[PDB]
Amino acid sequence: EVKLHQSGGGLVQPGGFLKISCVVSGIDFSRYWMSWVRRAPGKGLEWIGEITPDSNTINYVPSLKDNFGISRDNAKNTLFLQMTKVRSEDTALYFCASYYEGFAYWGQGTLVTVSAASTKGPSVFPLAPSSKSTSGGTAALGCLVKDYFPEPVTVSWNSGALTSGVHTFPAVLQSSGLYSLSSVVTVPSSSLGTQTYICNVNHKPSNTKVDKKVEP
Amino acid sequence: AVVTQESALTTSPGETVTLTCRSSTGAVITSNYANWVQEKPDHLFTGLIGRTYNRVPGVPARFSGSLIGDKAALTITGAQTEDEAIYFCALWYSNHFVFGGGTKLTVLKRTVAAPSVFIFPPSDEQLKSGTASVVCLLNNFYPREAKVQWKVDNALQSGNSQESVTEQDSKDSTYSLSSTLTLSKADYEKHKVYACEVTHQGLSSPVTKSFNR
Amino acid sequence: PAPGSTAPPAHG
Ligand SMILES: *[C@@H]1O[C@H](CO)[C@H](O)[C@H](O)[C@H]1NC(C)=O
């Protein structure tokens, strides 16, 4: 019934600019306060700002008023967030929200990635099973898919034949602007050496296809 | 300026749980218009409370707002497993909101599960690439809250590690976590012992997995 | 033309 449709998610370089939009339907946009917040892993939820129906009060958190600008167009039911001179720590999912007593209505989110990195294929390293990676009748092994840009990478094990106990973790964006990811699998401790374990990694942006055998 | 909440709380279905919200400037008062927002998986945000006491339309009655001592507070009466989620507090300071760090609320869906801890030394391949990554894996654990500390030569690390967590398992409600400690080959070779220390609810003592370079 | 009501904000 109520939809906050956000648009304008993508990649921007340090020092660049960007404008996100959020089109509201199902409520009388001209009668709601609107607000912008952002969510980043490890940085929790941060309130960016808010704007009244008539735009004559635009409140910002002092830390971000310098290079963030909130605006709205009531005739087109649209809320805008502009960001200038962005930096690496501005990487986050930005959300528009509409006040009704509290933060009542929410958009779907807009990913903004600030990185100076170039397109780059991953290095696939073996996470080797050992004494240090064994517990009971279970040994952990895996692959570290490191220093690639942009997302995503697809990881399978034994060309898809091995699926149970497979945990492919969300990638993390490193200080260098490149992503790193881990994919692990647990197998019987007695299975080591008897069976072969190979991680298949594909990163299309760099035409990278790598098959890595993981030895104890 | 800074808003602080409990990092994690555990309750059981049907029980009462109270989360608090502190201001670094002073006692939390009604003019801080404490807001409470819930985050469920897939970044599903739900406004719970505004201006300390007022429920957002549609929020069930079991979510209540109050002031307790010098803090704001959210109380969940008869907690449900669906209430398992992160709860962010927000305080108003004249002309801007400040969110707290959030409280991970567990509403026990099962017995507590301690993590299985594995550590992976770096590849010879990576070392030839000039870097070194030590990986610490916590497999199948519940609740989500857990502290993973890197210790190098028996000394706390900071600023050179990153964590990532899987989505909660649909069938056994467990999590898995990967923490990567990344250094340059030189920095990695300037030390001897590398250890991952893990603290979790299902652990009587912190568990440590270590190796010698 | 009567303004009409608006949606209540989170802060007062
Ligand atoms: C409606 O929003 C207006 C501003 O456009 C005022 O803030 C007014 O106080 C708000 N209404 C309610 C009921 O809070």
CB A133, CB A189: distance < 8 Å: no
Residue A198: burial class (beta carbons within 10 Å; 0-12, 13-18, 19+): middle
Q: Which of B175, B204, B10 lies closest to B108 in space, CA to CA?
A: B10
Pairing, β A3-7 against β A139-148: unpaired
Same domain, A110 and A127: no
Instruction: For residue A213, list its beta bridge partners.
Output: A198
Closest CA to A158 of A124, A128, A197: A197
Burial of A32 (0-12, 13-18, 19+ CB in 10 A): buried
The 3-state DSSP composition of chain C as helix, strand, coil percent (nearest 5) reads 0, 0, 100
**A102 lies in the same domain as A130:** no
Q: Say which residue the tokens 């050496």 belong to.
A: A193
Q: Using the beta-carbon criterion (under 8 Å), do C7 and A99 form an inter-chain contact?
A: yes
Domain boundary among B65, B85, B107: B107
Give nearest CA residue, ligand 1 atom 12: C8
Which residue matches tokens 């467990």? B174
Residue where a domain stops, chosen among B107, B125, B143: B107
Mutate to test the interface with B, among A68, A167, A168 (most CBs of B within 10 A): A167
The residues with which A142 forms a beta bridge, in sequence order, are A127, A184
Q: Which two three-digit tokens encode residue B136? A: 């610490």
By the 8 A CB rule, do B90 and B37 touch? yes
Q: Are residues B147 and B199 in the same domain?
A: yes
Same domain for A150 and A210, yes or no, is yes
- Cα(A44)–Cα(A81) distance, rounded to whole angstroms? 20
Neighbours of B205 (CB within 10 A): 6
Q: Residues A105, A173: one domain?
A: no
User: Same domain for A110 and A9?
Assistant: yes
- Do both A57 and A152 map to the same domain? no
Asked if A120 contacts A55 with a C-beta cutoff of 8 angstroms, the reply is no
Burial class (CB in 10 A: 0-12, 13-18, 19+), B213: middle
Q: Are residues B98 and B131 in the same domain?
A: no
Question: What technique determined this structure?
Answer: X-ray
Q: Which of A84, A114, A144 is the last residue of a domain?
A: A114
CB atoms within 10 A of CB A156: 18
Q: Is C1 on the interface with A (CB under 8 A)?
A: no
If asked whether residues A14 and A97 sit together in one domain, one would say: yes
Burial class (CB in 10 A: 0-12, 13-18, 19+), A132: middle
Please tell me the total number of residues recorded for chain A in this structure. 216
Resolution (A): 2.2
Q: C-alpha distances in angstroms, B20 versus B103, B126, B159?
A: 9, 46, 29
Token digits for C9?
């904000």
B127 in the same domain as B86: no
Contacts of B211 in chain A (CB under 8 A): 132
Q: Nearest-CA residue of chain A relative to C6?
A: A31
B35·C12 Cβ contact <8 A? no
Whether A100 and A53 share a structural domain: yes
Q: How far is A31 from chain C (nearest CA, A)?
A: 5
Residue A99 near residue A33 (C-beta atoms within 8 A): yes
| Domain of residue A197, CATH code | 2.60.40.10
**Which residue is closest to A215 within chain B, CA to CA?**
B123
- Note down the domain range covering B89: 3-107
Check CB contact under 8 Å for A132 and B178.
no
DSSP-derived letter for residue A206 is: G
Start-to-end CA span in chain B (Å): 44
User: DSSP readout, chain B?
Assistant: --EE--SEEEE-TT--EEEEEEESSS---GGG--EEEEEETTTEEEEEEETTTEEPTT--TTEEEEEETTEEEEEESS--GGG-EEEEEEEE-SS-EEE---EEEEE-SSS-BPPEEEEEPPPHHHHHHTEEEEEEEEEEEBSS-EEEEEEESSSB--SSEEEEEPPPPTTT--EEEEEEEEEEHHHHHT-SEEEEEEEETT-SS-EEEEEE-
Residues B32, B82: one domain?
A: yes
In sign, the C-alpha dihedral spanning A74, A76, A78, A80 is negative
Tell me the CA–centroid distance for residue B100 and ligand 1, in Å.
Answer: 26
- CB B78, CB A131: distance < 8 Å: no
Question: Identity (one letter) of the amino acid at A63?
Answer: S
| CB burial readout B176-187, b (16+ within 10 A) else e | bbbbbbbbeeee
Residues having CB closer than 6 A to ligand 1 are A 52-53; C 5-6, 8-9
Q: Is the dihedral of CA A126, A127, A130, A135 positive or negative?
A: negative
Beta bridge partners of A68: A83
Domain range enclosing A161: 123-214
State how far the Cα of B5 lies from the Cα of A89, in Å rounded to an integer. Answer: 23
Of B62, B85, B107, the residue at which a domain comes to its end is: B107
Contact C8 A100 (CB under 8 A): yes
**Which of A114, A132, A148 finishes a domain?**
A114
Query: How many of the other CB atoms lie within 10 Å of CB of A62?
Result: 10
- Structurally, chain A folds into a number of domains equal to 2
**Number of structural domains in chain B:** 2
CB B196 within 8 A of CB B117: yes
Residues A12 and A107 in one domain: yes
User: Which residue has its alpha carbon closest to ligand 1 atom 14?
Assistant: C8
Paired residues of A172 in beta bridges: A180
Mapped onto helix, strand or coil, the DSSP state of residue A132 is: helix
Same-domain status, A128 and A192: yes
- Boundary of a domain, candidates A114, A147, A163: A114
My answer on whether A110 and A29 are in the same domain is yes
